[PDB]
């Protein structure tokens, strides 16, 4: 329970080291996949620079606020968001079995794009159940984008 609640930075530095060592092992085993390990070290190694924001008061307090935003607000948001995303993803894949929507993975990505403001409400394709598709997408967009995503900003303000 102590690791599960405290000493996060030690875990992050350790995980960076593990990715490095796995990369070396894959290097000398004559594999090409070692690059896939290596970048996961590198992208972590820069973010751990925030460890050194302590020792400067303003940035240190800023980093602590980031920590509490991640644990208290974002963790509750992502559970409900994933439930809504998976529900509407399964419905859309069931409805339209062909073309960008023939798998859960592709449909999950295409629905995820709407939340970050680069959706694709085009409806140029010749689907069997167009005009039901539109109702499902409008319902999804209203529920996620307008309601939940602004509610996150309100809760972060209170926190």
């Amino acid at each position: 329970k102590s690791l599960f609640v405290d000493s996060y930075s030690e875990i992050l530095f350790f995980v960076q080291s593990l990715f490095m060592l796995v990369s070396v092992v894959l290097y000398f085993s004559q594999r090409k996949e070692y690059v896939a390990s290596m970048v996961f070290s590198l992208a972590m190694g820069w973010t751990n620079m925030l460890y050194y924001t302590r020792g400067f008061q303003q940035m240190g307090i800023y980093a602590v606020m980031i920590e509490k935003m991640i644990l208290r607000d974002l963790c509750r948001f992502m559970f409900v968001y994933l439930v809504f995303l998976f529900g509407f993803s399964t419905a859309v894949v069931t409805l339209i079995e062909d073309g960008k929507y023939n798998s859960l993975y592709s449909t999950c990505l295409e629905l995820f794009k709407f939340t970050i403001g680069m959706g694709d409400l085009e409806f140029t394709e010749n689907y069997d159940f167009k005009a039901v598709f539109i109702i499902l997408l409008l319902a999804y967009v209203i529920l996620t984008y307008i309601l939940l995503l602004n509610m996150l900003i309100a809760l972060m303000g209170e926190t």
């Binding site: 090409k32 409806f123 010749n126 069997d128 159940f129 167009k130 005009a131």
Partner: protein, 75 residues
């Protein structure tokens, strides 16, 4: 080198000739051959019929954007 049909792609290895094969988006995709363009035939809705609600239209028509769209000739 390239990955042939039936082999795992995109984890550091592309598929072979891309006029014949492709790597889908499925998180462990396998190279697959393309499939031909079968034309639309019966089971489609005809001109002046309710398109969109569970029945697409054949080649020579367009299904508009409307609540109850009817296929029509597009000029």
């Amino acid at each position: 080198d390239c990955a042939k049909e039936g082999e795992v792609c995109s984890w550091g290895k592309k598929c072979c000739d891309l006029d014949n094969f492709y790597c889908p988006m499925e998180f462990i995709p396998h190279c697959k051959k393309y499939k031909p363009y079968v034309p639309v035939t019966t089971n489609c809705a005809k001109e002046g019929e309710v398109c969109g609600w569970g029945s697409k239209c054949c080649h020579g028509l367009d299904c508009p954007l409307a609540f109850i769209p009817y296929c029509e000739k597009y000029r």
